[PDB]
Amino acid sequence: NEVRIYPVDYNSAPNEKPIKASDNSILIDTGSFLNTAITFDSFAEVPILIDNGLLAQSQQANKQKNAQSNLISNRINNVVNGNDLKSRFYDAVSIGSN
Amino acid sequence: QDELKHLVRNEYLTIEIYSWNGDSLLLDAGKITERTGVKLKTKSIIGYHNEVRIYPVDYNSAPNEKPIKASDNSILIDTGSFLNTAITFDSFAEVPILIDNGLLAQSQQANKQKNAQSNLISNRINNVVNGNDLKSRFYDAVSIGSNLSPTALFSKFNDEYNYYKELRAEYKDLALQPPTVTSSQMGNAFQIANSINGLTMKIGVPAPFDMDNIQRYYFMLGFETNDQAGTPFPIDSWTVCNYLRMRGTYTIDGIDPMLLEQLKVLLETGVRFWHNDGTNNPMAQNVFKNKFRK
Amino acid sequence: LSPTALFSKFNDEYNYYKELRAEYKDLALQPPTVTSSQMGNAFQIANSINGLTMKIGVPAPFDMDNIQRYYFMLGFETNDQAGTPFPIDSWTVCNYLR
């Protein structure tokens, strides 16, 4: 048992055509389509009579999840400075013998 | 068009081959020879242990490469990466078995964490050159001449050099968004539920306005080529704009030395030529119409 | 009595060529994939490639030309301390010295 919930029309450019079978069902929805989607797993579990049965839920909990939180910005490394414009303006006015 | 054949690069255009189990290939758009487009080849084992490995063909493979083969003529080692950068389809499926206390190997595989690269760094990040030196040299060259013109001369200078170094992208993106890496305990089962049990290719393209900006940039600024000791190619090549940036020891016949120095510095800064169109303002034209032959 | 234009005749390939230097050296063309099949070596036996494979990565001809031109024109770096410079007229055409 598993559920995967994904946004629709997300990061999908207009005019995109979603592939479908003869049934007309949308096999591949437009956009990320589970590339960035929530994965609901382990609907539940209850202790079972059989002993020595390792809980697969325990193993899944041992597995570590990783999720991004913030996005970096491109312009961090390179930033332009306006001192050049001030210098050019000063030179332009000064060269005029004003 | 031919002018934009170079536009097929990793950052601008993305092609992503996804196996919904969680594995991804993220083939970079570049290095795909125009001779043969994307052509995936699969090597598989089916039996006691089942596995598929799908790799691009003629990818990062220089021409004249010879692929080793046996007497059967089968290609044992295909040219290029050849599974060094390839998608690994595993766990075709699994169903619960009657035998109890049988640890699911699929569970152990899901516990194992997959790692896939998403973006490429750029070499020139740490070291970046600044054009202030050229401006200082030009100012010194003009001033040492005792020219009665004021410093406002240097004000007429234009500096797109720094702006266009700024516009350069720090990180190139192979895929539009990072690939998710989580393997379901059941395994491939989920894909079978929706009848999508197979590889899926998705193409990411820039928006039309960004594409227009990229086209304008490349048409106006030419293509970078750090050739050493090479004669500049014929200036009158493209119809409209032929950007050129030289830096070397040269002298035009019958030229005043100071004018030669000014021309040298100005070219080092980078000068754009607009071909005449028999109009009042040939400098203003539809750049997109620029074509290869003059 | 010459003006500052004298300094304009100066040439500065020093900064350009420090810029051209590579930040990261690459041992392999692309990063090696690290994933071990559960079966193990089995897969390689399927295609009869059960053994080591050596692959050689070489620069493209134009990049090779650029590298050759660079080294021929700029010599080889050697931070010798308190050493007499070697005979200038060694190579046929170009003998860069700093």
Author numbering:
A (entry chain Y): 344 to 441
B (entry chain Y): 295 to 588
C (entry chain Y): 442 to 539
Question: Which of the paper's sentences describe this entry?
Answer:
Staphylococcal picoviruses are a group of strictly lytic, short-tailed bacteriophages with compact genomes that are attractive candidates for therapeutic use. Here, we report the structure of the complete virion of S. epidermidis–infecting phage Andhra, determined using high-resolution cryo–electron microscopy, allowing atomic modeling of 11 capsid and tail proteins. The head has icosahedral symmetry, with the tail attached to a portal structure located at 1 of the 12 fivefold vertices.
Although the tail knob was expected to form a hexamer with C6 symmetry, it was inconsistently aligned relative to the RBPs, with two possible orientations, differing by a 30° rotation. We used symmetry expansion and 3D classification to generate a masked, focused reconstruction of this portion with only C3 symmetry, which was then resymmetrized to C6. The tail knob consists of a hollow cylinder, 145 Å long and 110 Å wide, and is made up of a hexamer of gp12. gp12 has a complex, intertwined structure that is similar to those of the gp9 tail knob protein of phage ϕ29 (45) and the streptococcal phage C1 major tail protein gp12 (46), to which it could be aligned with RMSD = 1.1 Å for 212 of the 588 residues. The N-terminal part of gp12 forms a β-sandwich domain related to tail tube proteins from many members of the Siphoviridae and Myoviridae bacteriophages, connected to an elongated β sheet domain at the bottom of the hexamer via an extended connecting loop. The polypeptide chain then returns to the top of the hexamer to complete the β sheet in the N-terminal domain. Residues 393 to 500 form an extended α-helical loop (the “channel loop”) on the inside of the cylinder, which constricts the inner diameter to ≈12 Å, presumably preventing exit of the DNA and terminal proteins. Most likely, these loops reorganize to become extruded through the tip of the tail during infection, enabling the resulting 12 α helices to insert into the host membrane to allow the passage of the DNA into the cell, similar to the mechanism proposed for ϕ29 (44). The focused reconstruction of the distal tail also resolved the hooks at the end of the β-hairpins of the tail stem protein (gp16) dodecamer that were not seen in the C6 reconstruction of the whole tail.
